[PDB]
């Protein structure tokens, strides 16, 4: 079948690689140095001769690149079009002088130009490198993750109990914090016999101890509502919801409100409550929330949500909230 | 008659079996062994040469696929293309990835492609089998569907003779926990002298102790609120609609507020309480709804709803709620 | 006169006649013998060889078609077709196999098909058969209308004491439970030099104590609330408003708040707070209520409500509001 | 000046004859004979061979015309069709069976035709007839307009010196009850100083205390907020609004927050208390209202409005509501 | 550079006098005796050979226009015709029988046709004289302008004082009452070295104690918040707002919120408290104030505006109101 | 690298200086000695041969440019159409009399023309000098900046502090207070290791203690906005936003919402209050609040912002907020 597959996927296959090398090779050329580092979260450009990373440890390394003909203006903007192009858009000094795209691999991608930029010579790249590895519970607890709690040996049972029983929860943060890296180890209390449906914008999550699953991409035209909405259509047991961000907000309202099988997303928050109320927040910026109180969906959330795991910049749990 | 009635059917039979023929092979060629199955509630292909199957007693089953020319990719995909040419739909890797539909008999089906899914040869397809069978109220009795209850003898008497009286009653509970079987089993103590007109998606509810009935159906352009509309029209004595979902909601309402009889209903929602709420939402989603208080629409439900049953994960009733 | 009035009349006769006689042979080969049947208030097929028909004492009694030629797919195909062409509609298969109508004198159709209906074969009539008969109030009486009150002669006197006056009276309860029956015997208590104007969807209000009428109705194109409209520019004493159901309802509130005389209306509601919910509900639905409370409407009505007359399923009186 | 007035009126002139004379034979044909009737209020022809006309007695007396050729079929179409083009509009069995128009010296006028009648040879006219008698406010009191009140001497010394001084008055009732009329006498107070701008439909207020001012009336594409809007822009003392309907309820609320002198108005109104509730409901109707709150424009009418005369069935005051 | 600037504006220029000319001759042909009057605040004909003017002691003069041509239809329409085109309008007796312009130099006028006066021979219009003279604020004092006041010598110690410092003072009252006149000598106690800009639609504010100074006009395609926008980019001191009158409302909230330096305006308002409410009314009818709460604007205001000052119909301060 | 980045921007410069280098001739032409000033804030000429000149201390100096031929008609007009042109618009007397625009340099320009301006020969232009230079912290320390405070020390510690720990801080007042020199002076106290992202209409903040950041402006089709949302997928540690105006404000709202790290912007508003209710009401001119209540967002803002700091027009702090 794999021959007769190979003919199937032929003219598919051929038209990605037409529009993927130009840009496979122009991100090596540019980034390949940067983009083999290790431990790092984030890769900058300041249109400056210099690039900057930035390290788990929460560091920016500058590096210079004042000797590269790969940051030359012109080597610039054939990668900046290469991304364009990628994902049918264009870039320009016009109407499109602000860009989000990918790369190959998935990592997102941010390029700014003139005149938003301060000048003429002035290119602005930002790429997010995804969360590629797996720690095991275990580690975070040797890391002392939990030693700022006060009842640490009740949030380990409350965690480790709580999703093998399948209770929605939360975890937040502010970004690079540790959220996704967090939701990937507890992932080892599902039952193995759960089916699970995960909705990312970016492979992150990986399936050491479950066999019986389905990952869910969106992107262009695409929405998370959309994934989500399919998902509920793919008989699930687990919902693991790569993160929260606007109209998808409500979608996972009702899915609460169903009375629905153990949930597990991240979101950007600075603390439980903050999250109680950001949740209202993004609900409302969706259409068929129009008739509903602030103070209703609040109040529905803080009833559907049995625990929120929140973590500070220094990637340590300093609340650890259970209804 | 019948010969004159075979020529008046000719044109339209013609034109169905040139459509779902190629459906009904495709369908067998891949599925037919899984289709046989008893007791099962849903079959699904994850894309990597397993097929996953559901059964009652709430386990997942795989199945190795990996020696059938079935689930290669060109086969999978030309039954995929059968699917949405059946509901007049197309179905690529481009702007329609994401498929809803139905096999020759009704099953509901859902069909991802790549993007969507992780990788071009990955294609994902889900099937939900039907309530295709009908358990007399005395075998769920036998079964002790009331065992966790403290007046057991008492909601088994609200029950009986509660709809005998034709109070409008609603099962909730989750994805597969046996709703609909349970209000099939219930129509028993409808007396046999009223009219039941259901509103359903598939054919699922049987009629063996009622003469005077129709069934309406819903799908494609004809929605469920357009067959509770036409249904108010055809003077039902008891309306046994398959589900809420939607919109739906709304016109449910008002046909609580008219005074109207014995309405049976089925939702997904975690408890009493649950579904009240449940109701209010997705009741608001519906325009002339808009100069409508949550509150007003809450306590609405509230005073029409004659008795709640909610069913846990393990197929028993875990509350009974009585006005 | 009326030979010059014969030749004014001559095309729009002929064309209506050419419209019409097709429908009037199919009505009559089908439902003639049924049409002719004593106290009876709707006719139902279910596609199924036999035709039901419900008596006005709440049975159903079957008759078997399965030897007749007139239900037939053929006819019975041909006999919807004429319905709908009738009130210049369609009635298919595809984006039309729902519709509504009206036979030859007045009658309300609903009819369904395949692919709404269970199958094929199936097709699904129903006709509502209009208030034709005119019972004295004194009859109501006789057959014990108010047994079933504490001030059986508060209620008879305030009823015929009160419309004499001219109080906005409304009489609720389910389908068929005599609401339009009741309003008609009441009609004797309104003085004889009343000017009265009614508002019907079909013909089913005698006048058999007053001269000074006209009578309006709606259908197609000419809604309710434009016969209402017209109607207030038409100098009535009494408003007799057939049954209230949507839009017309807020229309409806504002002539009782200009302080207007006696009007006489039906609806479908449980009890009188019932009622005075359904009376705020239904009137949302329409634009100009927009910036108006709910509570503001319900409370308005019962300030503007002089008296209301609920009926049960067994076409008596069992609560009689009065302010 | 005459002579060239008349060469500039040519035009216009022969254009309005042309249009207005088919319209002056017809109703002089068909009503003549009623229009010259003493103390009418209003001609009504149910299209049942007899022509009904209220007394201002509230009595109706039918008249026969069994044998007049003026009510043949033909004949009333020809008028009803002249009705119609005299104001640029149609009138016929289809899409245009209702009709709003004027005679030729603006008498209302409401048409209707079959399907909308009855039937067939059912045409339905109802004309209304005019204040065209000013009666002094020294006749009202001789009649007894105010005998059923507890401070007579006190209501009548309210009105005189009230608007004398310029305070805001309404006078509200049912249709025919004498509020123009009374309005009209009443003008007797307002200084003969004053200049007045009136707002009509039909030409009813006279002036005979005042030199100074002008009339405005609204019709056809002039709504009579259009009147309203260019009155505050001419300057005036004190401003008659002939009768409040829908929009310009809005638009006379801003009227009377800007301090404005002295206007009187007319309504349809129960009482006192259904006045302040009738006049924020239009309020509603109109978009700038929108963000404005029920209980903000009820109160908003309370501080502005100085006094209120409601007037019953028989032509008396029965309620005399002062601030 | 005056020979140079001329050929700058010979084009410009020769275009306004092909289109004002016509008018300033019809112009001084039927009003040049009423312009020259003295003390008169507006001009009135009432289509019926009587020219009333309206002195500033609040007395109507009557002049009889019967001999003269000027006032003869054609001279009339001429007129009107002049003034439509001036404003690139239009003026019949159809769609456009409503008319609102302005004269050669800036005063506006309103001019009514048939259908909408009362007949053929009538047209209407009315002029409004602007403010074109400045009295001292000595002036008023000396005419008793505060004696109706308790606290005298506190009012203009306030007023004095407070303008000075650049408190938000309001003026208000009726039309004609002197509210843009006494704002003009208050202008006396800002210091002169403040950066002036006014917003006005005709030319009435003089300054005599500021040389730097912008006017800003409104009308036709301009509105008055473009104006008042594009004051906020000139950097100003003080900001005379000539009137306040609906959207413009809004705008002028958000001016004093930002807390931005002393505002003087003119506004409709029958005393301190129907202000504060007038505010909040006009503010609601702009976009962006849906969202807001009314009791949240008449809050703002009440805490923005320093001082109001309200006129009689004599002519005098009657209410001084102080925060 | 340079020949090659030199031959890249050919065609962009090329474009540029054709547009622009007419703008600079011109600018220099008639305001070379003003922009040359020292210590000026704004340049207005009032259309009337003379330039007012505003200086940092508050005080305006006249100049006369009576016998220059830059401020001939003629030289102003080509200097308004080459500020149009250079932003791609036009002004003209008709549709287009007032511009919105920008020198070469970016400091902003509002040009008006006739009819807007009181006559013909007048053009008014007002340009805004950016805050162009740094001055330390200290400095506003010896100036005595936080005099007027009972708690000095307190505050100028909090501020140090706070800021050095990331806190969300806001700099309010009026124009030209001096709120974008204090925070850039404030900058001193940020973390040299913090990437800061700026976002800018005019190039104001300077960067002397930071090396990485980018700076984003906005105008023409870049909406504030647009740079904001760029912003957070650019991963910074700070954000400085220039200033907040309309739409904006929400979109702050959810970024301090998300928990970010210290946020640095100004605002103009009266007092620490204001500010909390001016947040609220921008923040409601952006749809994606219309389901917020203005209570709710009043509070978000207090309980998120951690300090306010408002600057009078003397250049000094009166009132230091701290949460
Ligand atoms: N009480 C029961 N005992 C054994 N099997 C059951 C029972 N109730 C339901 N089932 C089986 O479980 C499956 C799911 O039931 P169904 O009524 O369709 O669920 P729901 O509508 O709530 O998703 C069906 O195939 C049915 O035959
Ligand atoms: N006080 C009165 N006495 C006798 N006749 C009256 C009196 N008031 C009104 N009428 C007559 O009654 C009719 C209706 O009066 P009108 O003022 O037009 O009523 P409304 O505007 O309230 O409908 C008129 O023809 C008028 O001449
Ligand atoms: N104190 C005063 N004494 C005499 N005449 C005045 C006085 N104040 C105003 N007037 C005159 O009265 C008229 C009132 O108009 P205006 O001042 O513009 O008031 P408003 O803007 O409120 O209509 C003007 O023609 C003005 O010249
Ligand atoms: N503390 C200060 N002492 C002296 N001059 C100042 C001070 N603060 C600001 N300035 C000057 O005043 C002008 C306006 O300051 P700026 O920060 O741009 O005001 P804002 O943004 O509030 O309008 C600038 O030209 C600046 O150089």
């Not at 095991?136 to 709580?162: C, M, V, W």
Request: net charge neutral; with cysteine.
């Amino acid at each position: 079948l794999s021959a007769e597959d190979k003919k199937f996927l032929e003219v598919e296959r051929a038209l990605k690689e037409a529009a993927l090398n130009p840009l496979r090779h122009a991100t090596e050329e540019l980034f390949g140095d940067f983009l083999k580092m290790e431990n790092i979260t984030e890769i900058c450009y300041n249109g400056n001769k210099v690039v900057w990373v930035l390290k788990n440890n929460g560091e920016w390394q500058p590096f210079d690149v004042r000797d590269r003909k790969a940051f030359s203006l012109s080597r610039l903007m054939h990668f900046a079009r290469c991304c364009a192009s990628f994902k049918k858009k264009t870039i320009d000094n016009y109407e499109n002088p602000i860009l989000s795209s990918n790369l190959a691999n998935g990592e997102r991608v941010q390029i700014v130009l003139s005149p938003v930029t301060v000048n003429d010579e002035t290119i602005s790249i930002s790429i997010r490198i995804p969360s590629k590895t797996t720690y095991p519970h275990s580690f975070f607890e040797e890391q002392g993750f939990y030693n700022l709690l006060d009842n640490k040996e009740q949030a380990i049972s409350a965690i480790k109990d709580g999703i093998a029983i399948g209770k929605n929860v939360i975890v937040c943060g502010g970004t690079g914090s540790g959220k996704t890296t967090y939701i990937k180890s507890i992932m080892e209390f599902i039952p193995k016999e759960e089916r699970i449906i995960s909705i990312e914008d970016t492979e992150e999550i990986v399936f050491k101890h479950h066999k019986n699953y389905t990952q869910l991409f969106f992107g262009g035209n695409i929405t998370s509502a959309d994934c989500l909405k399919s998902c509920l259509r793919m008989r699930p047991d687990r919902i693991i919801l790569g993160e929260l961000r606007s109209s998808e907000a409500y979608d996972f309202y009702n899915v609460l409100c169903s009375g629905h099988k153990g949930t597990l997303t991240t979101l950007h928050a600075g603390s439980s409550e903050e999250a109680f109320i950001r949740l209202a927040n993004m609900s409302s910026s969706n259409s068929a929330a129009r008739n509903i109180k602030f103070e209703s969906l609040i109040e529905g959330f803080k009833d559907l949500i049995d625990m929120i795991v929140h973590i500070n910049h220094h990637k340590q749990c300093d609340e650890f909230y259970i209804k």
